[PDB]
Design a protein around this nucleic acid. Structure first.
Lengths: 634, 630
RNA sequence: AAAUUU
RNA sequence: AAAUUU
RNA sequence: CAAAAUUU
RNA sequence: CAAAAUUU
């Protein structure tokens, strides 16, 4: 058919980036802007052998920890077995035949695989063998162990909690929001649920037993209308009795970076709820998160949920922290993201910083906090939108139940329930906000105690005791270590050596200006490199190494000498065709230069990454524009 | 990745339209809005067999005509052999190695292949065998014959022409344009050339010897800047001598619907020019075609290039035609599209209509007309954009050369040239405009002669002689038969039985309103159906698309043709109707929708074959759920 | 598709 | 991608 | 990957 | 399928 020459050129370029052999031929003589790198310490085969050795030792340790016996699940209420859902949508049951079914009973099987790399081979190629070996034997990305899973589940379900003193007024002070940014919940429900964002490959939960992508029509067309009709009729107890799997959850073992020494003691449990329930509550949660302010925007906010290190965020944290005041006389600067807190106070005019963490904070989350957070979010919406008060208040009751008393399967047909309402069931929508509020309520009380003159609470022993006795929260060991802050750090200097949100804060130099950037020691970047959170062709594996190397540089590895070198070596080792191939993005052929990453963390206007091959576009299109004037004199 | 549920539903729908087995399952109980159709006259096996039989006979006749010896090509100038282009673009020669090369010399091979069906099988399945057989044996889509190709080439190249008397003023009256709709040619050349439209699978010609899609970078990056530099240095003669293939064309046989009786005498020739030269001139031609007005827009216009039968166009022709005046005293209504012309005169106050066609009109196109059209177009641009006058005047000279004296290859290495400047080399950019203008100049002069009282020219013998002697144009036999017009036709009545642009005009009834629509007898529609101008899934989709297209062209206004096309659409499996296609096209042309298209109604989508298809493919139908309930 | 974080 | 036209 | 925040 | 016009 007839097409413009521009359109033909565009189509050709798209097709050309999908032809690897063509890309190889076109870029075979192209100039490459190579990243700064560190040299090879050993050959390909030596690196592969050292990797194979460490991988064999790790697989032995993981297999041994997975063989460890687990304690009984008698700490949980036993609710029996549930029949498989018989709801039919069109030609198929919502619960697929032959799946999650033992004699008409819903069943699950916990997977604890022995695991098993390209990244480890690259580390041995460019780094000291002893350091790489010690780093890779210390931490591994694994499904964990039955023993660690049950142990952590016991702690999360059996912790004695302290009911917080919380009002909507306190929550407005600690967690301010913009009411105009809240979505209109008085709108039609179908449109609202369609607006929620989700992980397409995540499990839709019972009764779908498939990805949210595959189960979306069964949710929207069949189950969600059923649920709505029972909500508006106050007949949800009938729905639960007739269809229990509609309100069933799955306790799952989290695949995570786990310390090899503690694999038998710690495997984190999470709960996978039904899609219909999650989607309804996500209308309220995703709207509220959009309206939520952060501490840098409001001095009263204890909220770091939403904070970005980029676009001046790192410097914003320092500006916010310096406005901290003398303990007992003026307010401290406290910001919380779940279990992670940044605390700033002044003693004799000198700024000090504490970066404490809590242990299994979800078990400590009391039911009063959960109900109050739900009331705060629901009330925020019904104030701005009063026409839909009753429906969303009923959704709030479903939210509290999913967060505290949802029945759940672990392995097999037995359904269990937490004996106590206290304890957040991690995985419910709002998990991070519930944890953030609990932390902020405790730290707000701690600051009130300092204004009352209890300055001994700045000290570790008293602080640990305060959070346990008054708030049921256990301070992680080593996390209460007050440190003098370098308030105006010179070039190449750290604010403190402590980490907030997993990263240290450092000042770097651009001309004579100071740019605040995230930083970590080399060992920390090396741990992340060797332990990919990977869920296949050689090409995709080569692209994955390039993408991971670029990601770690943008996260701050560009500010560590050895990490910048390793990631540069991986990027430079990537074939030209793999760098310039068509890829799924948010063609990504740029690289993170030191200057680009400095610009990202600065308040500079956004810019594209410098190109690895500056002539790639012209070479792939086989055409470079030459200006040809029609106004010449002939 | 993190995505909205709305976006996930949109992704799912697109993917499902590409899963034909899933489409089959989800549409297995769907209600189908079946098109009106005529019944099966015979079974699949019998229809396939009768098709095979007619096909065997037709192949034999085509092979016999293809075997006929051809006459000599000595009527043309012989320019020797041209060396293969040695220009290199990076790692590859612009002229590919191993292609179009005989001992270093540019070569081509004409293809005259025999043979060419699903459509004929459908016709035998739903129509009388005798009519279908007669129809299929009369016309075939073929590459033609060597004998017919050379005969037509001789006619096109050796015809005595008459130089028209033309001015920019006559051309402004007969072909008015909107100057502001002209593209700014004062702009940078690369941008202007990237703005042009082209057939991606058409030949880029010498020296690329590949599709325009494959040759586009070699043209833009290597040849176009070489050509530009020589244009501004007046050194094009040097470029031609060093690189002659840059200015070489290929004379090719046109694959077309041809009468089997005349295959040995008639195979149409066309010229395939270099992409670089074509693209440069296409800047001017495509811009001018955008600005051109039609007879319905300007009463002075004799131009039907740009006319649409749709959106009231058919009725616009009737309104325009009735404005005709008495022969001898007031202006007739004349519109021309290449060789095709619609003429309306009033004799004794009664509207009359002539629809004549010229024969091998391109040979009759004189050099003065070609030069004048080029000058008219170049001048239009340089008047609105004067800073670029010199460049486009040089491009104008290349345009006239391509239209008249381009060296060309036919078969093998011999390069040829038309001995006379006269004669249009069909295939040059502007071919249809050159033909339209020549026709219009001749008919403007015929009208001037009528106003002089030579009203005898309304008669066949007189008109034929006038066009041959005064304009070098040969009126096709039968095309001069004036006819009384039904100025306001009744429901189901033709304006005339004559064909303009291949179609009759007819009034149909919608409510009590009249809708003017195109029309043809069933035998014409069946000829088009059995002679298509061309995986089982692709073949089934093609039948559905061809049936829909013919209904939209007017087959819906013929009882038997509507029935046959409806039978083909109804026979198409649901998955093939609803599958993702290059333009989701799951609609069908109802009689009412086609009446709407030809009316001045606001555009609407075709009625769906499966109205619940979208909801079934998505497996979801929206149910309103109010959050403001108690 | 990828990085970090809880 | 498909229809008609020159 | 259960919910998520930030980023490319 | 050489240039094209109209249409889906």
């Amino acid at each position: 058919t007839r097409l413009s020459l521009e359109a033909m050129l565009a189509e050709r370029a798209m097709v050309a980036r999908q032809d690897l052999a063509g890309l190889k031929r076109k870029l075979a003589g192209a100039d490459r802007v190579l990243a700064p790198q560190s040299p090879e310490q050993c050959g390909r085969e030596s690196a592969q052998a050292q990797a194979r050795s460490v991988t064999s030792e790790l697989k032995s340790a993981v297999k041994e920890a997975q063989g460890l016996e687990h304690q009984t699940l008698d700490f949980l209420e036993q609710l029996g077995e549930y029949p498989v859902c018989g709801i039919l949508h069109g030609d198929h049951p919502v619960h697929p035949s032959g799946t999650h079914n033992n004699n008409g009973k819903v069943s699950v099987k916990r997977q604890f695989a022995a695991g098993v790399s390209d990244a480890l081979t690259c580390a041995f190629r460019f780094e000291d063998s002893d350091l790489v070996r010690e780093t890779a034997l210390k931490t591994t990305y694994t499904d964990g162990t039955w023993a660690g899973f049950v142990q952590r589940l016991k702690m999360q379900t059996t912790r004695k909690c302290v009911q917080e003193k919380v009002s909507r007024k306190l929550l407005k002070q600690l967690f301010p929001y913009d009411p105009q940014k809240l979505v209109d919940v008085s709108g039609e429900l179908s449109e609202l649920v369609l607006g929620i964002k989700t992980n397409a490959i995540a499990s839709a939960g019972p009764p779908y037993w498939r990805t949210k992508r595959d189960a979306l029509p069964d949710m929207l067309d069949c189950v969600l209308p059923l649920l709505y009709d029972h909500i508006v009729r106050k007949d949800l107890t009938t729905l639960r009795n007739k269809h229990p799997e509609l309100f069933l959850a799955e306790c799952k073992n989290k695949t995570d970076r786990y310390e090899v020494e503690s694999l038998g003691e710690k495997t984190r449990p999470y709960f996978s709820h039904p899609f219909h329930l999650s989607a309804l509550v996500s209308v309220l949660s995703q709207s509220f998160s959009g309206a939520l302010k952060i501490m840098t925007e409001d001095s009263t906010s204890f909220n770091a949920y939403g904070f970005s290190w980029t676009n001046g965020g790192a410097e914003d944290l320092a500006i916010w922290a310096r406005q901290a005041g003398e303990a007992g006389k003026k307010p401290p600067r406290i910001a919380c993201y779940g279990d992670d807190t940044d605390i700033y106070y002044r003693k004799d005019g000198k700024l000090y910083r504490i970066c404490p963490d809590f242990k299994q904070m979800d078990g400590s989350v009391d039911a009063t906090t959960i109900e109050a957070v739900v009331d705060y979010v629901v009330d925020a919406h019904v104030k701005q939108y009063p026409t839909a008060r009753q429906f969303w208040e009923e959704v709030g009751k479903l939210w509290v139940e999913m967060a505290t008393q949802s029945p759940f399967l672990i392995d097999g047909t037995k359904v269990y329930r937490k004996m106590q309402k206290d304890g957040l069931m991690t995985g419910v929508v709002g998990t991070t906000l519930f944890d953030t509020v609990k932390s902020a309520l405790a730290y707000n009380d701690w600051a009130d105690q300092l204004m009352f003159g209890s300055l001994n609470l700045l000290e570790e022993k008293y602080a640990i005791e305060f959070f346990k006795n008054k708030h049921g929260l256990v301070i992680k060991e080593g996390t209460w270590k007050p440190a003098l802050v370098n308030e105006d750090p010179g070039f190449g200097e750290l604010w403190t050596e402590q980490k907030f949100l997993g990263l240290q804060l450092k000042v770097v130099r651009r001309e004579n200006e100071k740019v605040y950037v995230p930083n970590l020691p080399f060992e920390d970047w090396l741990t992340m490199w060797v332990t990919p959170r990977s869920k296949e062709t050689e090409t995709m594996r080569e692209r994955t190494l390039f993408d991971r190397a670029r990601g770690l540089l943008v996260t701050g590895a560009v500010f560590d000498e050895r990490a910048r070198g390793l990631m540069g070596a991986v990027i430079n080792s990537t074939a030209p065709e793999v760098v310039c191939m068509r890829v799924q993005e948010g063609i990504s052929d740029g690289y993170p230069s030191y200057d680009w990453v400095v610009s990202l963390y600065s308040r500079d206007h956004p810019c594209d990454m410098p190109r690895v091959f500056p002539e790639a576009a012209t070479l792939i299109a086989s055409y470079r524009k030459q200006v040809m004037d029609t106004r010449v004199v002939i």
